[PDB]
Amino acid sequence: TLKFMTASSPLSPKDPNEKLILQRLEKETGVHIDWTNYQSDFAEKRNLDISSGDLPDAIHNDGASDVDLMNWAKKGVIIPVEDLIDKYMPNLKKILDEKPEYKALMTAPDGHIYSFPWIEELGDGKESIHSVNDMAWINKDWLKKLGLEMPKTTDDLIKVLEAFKNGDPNGNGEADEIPFSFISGNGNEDFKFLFAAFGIGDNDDHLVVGNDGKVDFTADNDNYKEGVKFIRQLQEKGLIDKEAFEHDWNSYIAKGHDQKFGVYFTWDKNNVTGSNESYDVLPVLAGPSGQKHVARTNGMGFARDKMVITSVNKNLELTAKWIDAQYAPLQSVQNNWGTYGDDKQQNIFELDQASNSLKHLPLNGTAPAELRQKTEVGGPLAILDSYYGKVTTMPDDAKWRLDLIKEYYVPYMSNVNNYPRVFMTQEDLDKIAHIEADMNDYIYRKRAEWIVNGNIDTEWDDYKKELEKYGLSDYLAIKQKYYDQYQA
Template structure:
């Protein structure tokens, strides 16, 4: 079958499919007489053909003039991969390239030791695509650059639109229609909807078995408090910071936070929030959401709809739900969190690489910042799972689409060509939006489009200023920050549940809760994070 690459030959030769200017040319070296050997450490995706045997790997090698000596970890479990990576670093038996995540702290640590080499000059001389991306993407340079001014890792850019607005509430639209209710827009309206769900038998089985609102812990935005608190004060669900005119501050000790807790406590005491929302994990909630027989879930929080009802062939319960827009609180607050999906450094060159290998490695990374690479890495070389869009097929923005996923892409259980999403790649919002959208979003092939449409309800409600999700911390502060953040976040989250469930009294215990932050070194923590934020803004 025809590959995407062969249908777009000029795209590959120019290496500029992501709207790059003419100065961002292909960095491939397929004409080199002898390939440059590179040893690369990476996690072997269990859903993919072994990397050394892939047609995609051969294509990458041909395009870049490298020969990859794979050192793979047979797991995508980040803990296992990190353990193997740390063992290699500790022993000194390291590859030329690590194509696995390095945290900001690790980049600084191993960069300062000379284990990871600075990439600034290599990027400037041999990586026009990466250089252009740093110019075009406002947040990229600041989050790549360590406090010492060096770049030690190339991140993967994945501007997943629906992922970037992850604090979502999903509500049963069929129940709303049955009870003659409108989509709630305020916290007061939402409370009335939940009462109707609980009391008026919307599933029609004659039992009061409905759970008005549920959620789950320790997973992507499953906690109900993250969505609801944004109707009172911005809650990023990670640092609990706000930024106002460049000043970093904690949200969780402010009067607005207390108001949010009072609201959620009232919902809980009225039986409108499931107690399990504060104790169960995502697996337990999935069982609840796919409860045999009648549907019992009115609303739930989750990063995407399918973290509840199963989005699979033959299962239709998920089609009963739609996204709730950010609710407006009693004081007019109406926020959501917007996070840009820039991961940590996923491509780092070590001091083991010779000069020739380092140049070949950065050229490889630069090739990975092209659209043909991003497409073939995900879908493989066969053309079985994606094809060029036909004339008249429209993308998310109503433009002529570039690509169309085939029905075969929905198949599971077969090993695929392509590396999946290991290492760096340039998947901008514009690229992700360039695929054909289906007419009906409530289908399996239309699910991604449904998430896009749902996310449009949230765009524009993010705070004007927000604390980045990933920042470089000065090495001399890093250890303290880790302890501070762990202790403070635990204190916030545990206290939140206690206040909501009534184990702590908001009238009697609030002041002591606020004072308790001083014992956890909050002023020092905020001061350090302010310094990191200022450095990020300066480098950006």
């Protein structure tokens, strides 16, 4: 018996032990987990537990930031685990011996390892499945219906959206068409993907790496100004979803499912407009001066912390062995993606007993993300490029996305490098975190304000000064420092 805090989807059972995977796991391991399972606001609820001294044995599927992780280590909330890996975790050792770069990625600059990672190999470099998150999707049915060609430029896009607005492409005599929509902020449904059509573009870090080796701050660039102006034009012309700055995922996908969107953003259309050929990828567009670019995210198939062990943990050896069971290939694949042989609900896999390998089943039009979030576990695991065809099939939705990324975006990803996943010192993390406490929401708040009020030209210099007062220069110097050490 161990006590784990975890994070899961609101679609999944309130008690994680209702998951088929965890049932089978308790049989296999003989460990029963008592779960504290937060399904909304995990990070905030976790932090209250930590602040009140109400710690589990370990926090599963945690996803803490680096600053959190180091703060917790310094205050003795969590423990270093490297001795536990050496002594009790042969599955993990195997992985780290085959792919030693993950060990580097796990290790803090004080020399300790504080967390167990998630590793999922799907594409490399520019071809990473993570290279673009908020892909743009377009209603090709409407285009074909209105006699329109796929737009090639930002100007074409405006015209297409105007025709969507006024042209009644769904043919019901109603102005029900929402030409352009998004969910504003970080994440897969934001519009920042289009900013690159004005050069450089933007990502959730607001940080790219120039081909000069200089870290660039995106959200102060004239190019970024132009991107905001473009979205403002869309606003002024009545082409943006009237609730874009208010709605949520559930509302976004309700409209999606009714196919109200002309152009919208998401990871995979199948989750929002469904599994049809009405919507396809919006190809990379040329800006007005011929800019044609895809900004790279800094995302990768690695998250440093999907589990930590607290300093109250009862049985370090038992914990460490339980965790290592998650790194066995079959377990890792399932924990990540779902399972087989549920006699009562849909299954992501079938187990082929002849090979003892997993195989992706077709979904009867069920959303990718929907069944997954019900049946996955998250937590620490590894899926290596050598598992495909031997331990498991590659997901078809993954393969498909990798193809799209390679076909539509890679040619226009002209930045040789993105920002590497460094592990900064505690002091530097703390410094950075203070700065981001000001910048982060300020950056989104002004972006939205300018789209809605049209005053970017008169507020831009003052916004840049404000960003300097928050410490943007110190922030960049720190970023650049770690990028330079990484390259050396």
